[PDB]
Write a protein that binds this ligand. Structure first.
Ligand SMILES: CCC(=O)SCCNC(=O)CCNC(=O)[C@H](O)C(C)(C)COP(=O)(O)OP(=O)(O)OC[C@H]1O[C@@H](n2cnc3c(N)ncnc32)[C@H](O)[C@@H]1OP(=O)(O)O
Ligand SMILES: Nc1ncnc2c1ncn2[C@@H]1O[C@H](COP(=O)(O)OP(=O)(O)OP(=O)(O)O)[C@@H](O)[C@H]1O
Ligand SMILES: Nc1ncnc2c1ncn2[C@@H]1O[C@H](COP(=O)(O)OP(=O)(O)OP(=O)(O)O)[C@@H](O)[C@H]1O
Ligand SMILES: *C(=O)CCCC[C@@H]1SC[C@@H]2NC(=O)N[C@@H]21
Ligand SMILES: [Mg+2]
Ligand SMILES: [Mg+2]
Lengths: 133, 592, 70, 482
């Protein structure tokens, strides 16, 4: 069988297919709750959490950690909604050539409220910063 | 029926060309792409795109069922095969016709007859074309070859009856080489093409390659759109072409034109096709082949004659009679250069890589038909061609001057190409000529050209000084614009601050594993030297082999590379099978 | 002969423009030409002002390391 | 007495074209760039490049002293002005000749005579060229124009005897308009052309603008490279052009190929140039102008006739007789589209901005002459033309089909362009003639065309040095770190 370009996904059982899968997931992390929420933020006149990090740090210096994290709660039907990153963007970078560790909370994910994986990511960057000085 | 939607069953610059022709004619276009081509220009250019799947041609473009399924799903009522792949597959043509789609090409019977060399020889003889002396029928033994050599004088060329791609011919200089050459030719033909039949003819010493472009309709009309000279060849495949054929007497020119028409009419040929001849140093013409596909060279004839050959081919497929009644008069002179992803300084050996930059020339007399753009990646599975640069002028001298300009402008980065060779040849006196003749021939590049091109190295730092960072600045000194590069540790005058408390500069080591002296330091594994496809496996597990014995044959860039045993021992743990794609460093087998 | 030289990638200046360019560039160059070795003075180093627990591994990896780096 | 090194005293597309011509001919090329053009493609393409300074044309490209100093410093022995700027300035041509350089173009006398449209009309009369009725001398006052209107019949056209750009035209429809129109014409001619002389003639309603490219020798030989049509215009300036001129009768192609030769020979013209005519609905050809420079639309003539007109200019300046002995026969049809940085959805208004993406089409019958590339920034200091797309084919219909393809492929982002207008017009039936005539004219775009286009949405450091007997300036980036 042949497929139209829209529906085709490279065979996941190949290295190229696995790279394509990683690209798809990375692209999804850009708008974890849909492009409508990003548009709402911009219309409100604010920057997204990612835009804030990219604006603060030097260009091309951001390395993100736990980008694909998801929450593991099952209470009150939370399991039906598991946005990537769980509402906080964490990583490290440079400001004026000097290394820093950074986190930025995302108000579009559960109102920006802190969950377990959220807090775990923040703890990870805090430990990294203390460790690296 | 009339073409309404064309499926281009090809890839690259030819796919782009046919898609553009369909757009010009107002027809819908459907492209089919393998997984490596998911982002090629043609996939985006075509009105529709379909994913054949598979990582190699044997499972992507050479599958009749996949191409026909794409046609069925897209609703395309015509199929155009480009060139290569299935363009000369009579079985595929008949399959398309049976499926009930307009096959944009010659009939399957014409394909068969003109693809069978001996049948082609019969057709040419019946058409009274100029032929070189040779055996009318396949030779049965080296004894017959020896008798023919005695009769007609050495050298003598032995050619496979179904050979193509330049691999199907070998030469004997003396009567003693005939037996070994015969047996090896038969053994290689049975393997490369299935059929081991071969025949023998006279070999020309320094021949030119001249071909005629023929546009023939289904109503019996045939028109010779022009002649081309393709005397510059790496091994037996063209690199640079001209239109019209330079320095040919009117007698030779009219002989070619008439022989081409006669051959096509005797073969019943229709659609765009080409007739290839050879012209020896004596001036004698010798019919060589009939290509039943659209030549890659066609743009030079398009420029000189002012005809759209792809659209003519659409019309012929539609069944309309030719709207051209006489051979067009050439205007100007056009050169064509193939931009192959090969390193001229390394014996023209193709290698894959990314096109990190691609800036084509533009302006007077320049046409560029490319299948890649900046950001494209050349894998190891398909042909090395990236684009074709056509430069047209009022005369041959004007075309050469414009070609020098255009090749100076043309820029590619990320992988090697043949631009340095084109730049050198367009100024070599042997190619310029004396105004009445020139010294180029089919073997000129590989045996007479003074190859001054150094191997491609990209931006890799090789020497100790290459490791120092640099900043490039624009400086105006008395108006003059200068582009000055400054090292990061320049101690000019009293300037200092060089290096750091413990910084040492040293010659970097190449990203290669040692050398031959440690080919396998207690290493039993046989590792693939390059990415490609295992097209042959010459051993089986438990087989004893000696150093130099062939283990596998990997096809990369449509060229075969043999991987041989590095040590004496028993083949153990054979890990690959024919048709398996292989990455560099993969363990093929362990010799123990 | 393995040292990084200045390169004029584009342009063909004449001796006068070359001389002017080189003079200006040499004048622009400066900084520490042939500096003396930077004098070690550990007096009042920040590491000595820190509270270390009596069993702190930083007493080895930060305090002793800083005092001994040479 | 032979060109050895050519300085191109222009910018952009024409600079690139002339530099390429010099490279083809084997000549060395020297480009000159103003401050905004430090990154222009011609600067890097030319063998040598010189900075003229200045932020605008009045400071950089229009200064005789700067251009001639650049030539002297570079050692270039010839100067090619392209088009615009000083290409038609007789004073600059005379200065170039006096400096001992080869002026690639017509003589100062020819330029001066044919730039005065009154003297141009006199030469046309002497050459017996077709002429639209009008005053043979500048009109003294609005009363004379009123008398002429009464004599011949409105509408009427008023034009400054000097200058151009298309804006010099004023139109009067009734006898009451003349006073104010003439007063405005006199004021504008005084203010923007430096000379208040104005003249009057009959106004054609819906004419077709037709030209004939002429290659004129220094030895008297004259050859008409071919006709051309530029009827599609806005603000009296061209946007799309064709070659050969379509749908002219043989009797019309003749008398044009001959009026051009007669007018050029009478004026003593040598070098490349063009003779612009007008064809009214009635079918009457009328002499309009003579451009004494290489014209923008030369590529279509080059494609159809096979002549390289810039190299022909080099050969004429060298003084060699023309190698072309008879008028070439066109081998096909060619369209030329100007890629101007203008928003067609906003009344063709200039829009300065960055060229974030510029993907030129390529393939059969497509040629591109561009002065920009991805990353270029377009300001208001200069004309808004970015490139020229030439599409050639065996017939007019094939050329139109190829144009529809090439325009679909051509992509530009970051600023507005007339690409949408080109895409629309190439498919508009008025421009796809029925087979023997077509409906467009010098005002079709603004008046009939259905405009459906949606609107688009550190200082350098300098040092002064003296080496021997010269004073030099070394300019460096402000943040040179060294
Ligand atoms: C230490 C213990 C604590 O801190 S108890 C947590 C405090 N409770 C709060 O919600 C703080 C005050 N909250 C609010 O009233 C609003 O959410 C505030 C923060 C003012 C933001 O208002 P506004 O920007 O209009 O948003 P909204 O409330 O209309 O909708 C926000 C979406 O996110 C949700 N959300 C919000 N807060 C939480 C939370 N703490 N836990 C879980 N979900 C939360 C809202 O329900 C709403 O979700 P949805 O988009 O309607 O599906
Ligand atoms: N008799 C001959 N003497 C010298 N060279 C020859 C002779 N026959 C063939 N050649 C060389 O072979 C080249 C092409 O050979 P041939 O036509 O048999 O194969 P091909 O072009 O690869 O085939 P195809 O296009 O059908 O796959 C010619 O250009 C010439 O270089
Ligand atoms: N008599 C006329 N009737 C109608 N339109 C005219 C007439 N004379 C000139 N035009 C218009 O003027 C423009 C061309 O005029 P012309 O070239 O003489 O002017 P210009 O300002 O010097 O222009 P340029 O120097 O750019 O060619 C075209 O728009 C043409 O339609
Ligand atoms: C396959 O990927 C493309 C076909 C490349 C080979 C064909 S063979 C015949 C033509 N001659 C040539 O050099 N390339 C074409
Ligand atoms: Mg061949
Ligand atoms: Mg004009």
């Amino acid at each position: 069988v042949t497929e139209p370009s829209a529906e085709h996904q490279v065979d996941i059982h190949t290295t190229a297919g696995k790279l394509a899968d990683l690209k798809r997931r990375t692209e999804e992390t850009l708008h974890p709750v849909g492009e409508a929420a990003v548009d709402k933020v911009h219309a409100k006149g604010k920057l997204t959490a990612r835009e804030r990090i990219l604006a603060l740090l030097d260009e091309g210096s951001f390395v993100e950690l736990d980008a694909l994290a998801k929450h593991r709660s099952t209470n009150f039907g939370l399991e039906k909604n598991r946005p990537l990153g769980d509402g906080v963007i964490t990583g490290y970078g440079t400001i004026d050539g000097r290394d820093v560790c950074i986190f930025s909370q995302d108000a579009t994910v559960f109102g920006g409220s802190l969950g377990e994986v959220y807090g775990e990511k923040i703890v990870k960057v805090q430990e990294l910063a203390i460790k690296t000085g | 029926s009339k073409i309404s939607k064309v499926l281009v069953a090809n890839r690259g610059e030819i796919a782009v060309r046919v898609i553009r022709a369909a757009k010009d004619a107002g027809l819908a276009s459907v492209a089919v792409y393998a997984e490596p081509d998911a982002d090629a220009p043609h996939v985006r250019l075509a009105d529709e795109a379909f994913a054949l799947g598979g990582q190699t041609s044997a499972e992507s473009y050479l599958v009749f069922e996949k191409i026909l399924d794409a046609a069925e799903k897209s609703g395309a009522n015509a199929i155009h095969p480009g060139y290569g792949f299935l363009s000369e597959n009579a079985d595929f043509a008949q399959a398309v016709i049976d499926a009930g789609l307009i096959w944009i090409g010659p009939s399957p019977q014409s394909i068969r007859d003109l693809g069978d060399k001996v049948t082609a020889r019969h057709i040419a003889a019946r058409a009274k074309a100029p032929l070189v002396p040779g055996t009318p029928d396949p030779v049965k033994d080296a004894d017959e070859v020896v008798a023919f050599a005695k009769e007609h004088g050495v050298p003598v060329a032995i050619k496979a009856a179904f050979g193509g791609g330049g691999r199907g011919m070998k030469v004997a200089r003396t009567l003693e080489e005939i037996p070994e050459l015969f047996e090896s030719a038969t053994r290689e033909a049975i393997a490369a093409f299935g059929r081991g039949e071969c025949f023998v003819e006279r070999y020309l010493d320094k021949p030119r390659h001249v071909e005629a472009q023929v546009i023939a309709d289904q109503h019996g009309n045939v028109v010779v759109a022009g002649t081309r000279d393709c005397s510059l060849q790496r091994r037996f495949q063209k690199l640079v072409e001209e239109a019209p054929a330079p320095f040919l007497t009117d007698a030779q020119r009219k002989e070619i034109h008439e022989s081409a028409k006669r051959i096509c009419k005797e073969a019943g040929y229709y659609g765009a096709g080409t007739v290839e001849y050879l012209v020896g140093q004596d001036g004698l013409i010798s019919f060589l082949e009939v290509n039943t596909r659209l030549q890659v060279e066609h743009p030079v004839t398009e420029e000189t004659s002012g005809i759209d050959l792809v659209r003519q081919q659409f019309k012929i497929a539609n069944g309309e009679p030719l709207d051209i009644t006489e051979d067009p008069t050439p205007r100007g002179h056009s050169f064509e250069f193939r931009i192959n992803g090969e390193d001229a300084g390394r014996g023209f050996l193709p290698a894959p890589g990314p096109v990190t930059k691609f800036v084509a020339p533009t302006g007077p007399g320049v046409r560029m038909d490319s299948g890649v753009e900046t950001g494209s990646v050349i894998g190891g599975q398909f042909d090395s061609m990236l684009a074709k640069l056509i430069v047209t002028g009022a005369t041959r001298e004007e075309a050469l001057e414009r070609s020098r300009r255009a090749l100076a402008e043309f820029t590619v980065e990320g992988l090697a190409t043949v631009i340095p060779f084109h730049r050198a040849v367009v100024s070599d006196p042997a190619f310029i000529g004396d105004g009445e003749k020139f010294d180029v021939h089919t073997r000129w590049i590989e045996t007479e050209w003074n190859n001054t091109v150094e191997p491609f190295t990209g931006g890799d730092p090789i020497e100790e000084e290459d490791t120092v960072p640099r900043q490039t600045v624009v400086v105006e000194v008395g108006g003059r614009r200068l582009e000055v590069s400054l090292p990061g540790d320049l101690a000019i005058g009293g300037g200092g601050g060089a290096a750091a408390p413990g910084v040492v500069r040293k010659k970097p080591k190449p990203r290669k594993r040692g050398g031959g002296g440690a080919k396998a330091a207690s290493g039993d594994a046989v590792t693939a030297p390059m990415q490609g496809t295992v097209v042959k496996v010459a051993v089986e597990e438990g087989q004893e082999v000696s150093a130099g014995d062939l283990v596998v044959v990997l096809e990369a860039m449509k060229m075969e590379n043999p991987v041989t045993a590095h040590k004496d021992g028993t083949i153990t743990g054979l890990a690959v099978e024919a048709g398996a794609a292989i990455t560099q460093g993969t363990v093929i087998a362990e010799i123990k | 002969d393995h040292e990084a030289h200045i390169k004029v990638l584009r342009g063909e200046p004449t001796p006068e423009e070359m001389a002017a360019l080189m003079a200006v560039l040499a004048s622009a160059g400066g900084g520490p030409a042939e500096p003396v070795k930077k004098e070690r003075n550990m007096w009042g180093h920040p590491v000595d002002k820190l509270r270390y627990s009596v069993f702190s591994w930083q007493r080895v990896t930060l305090l002793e390391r800083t005092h001994m780096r040479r």
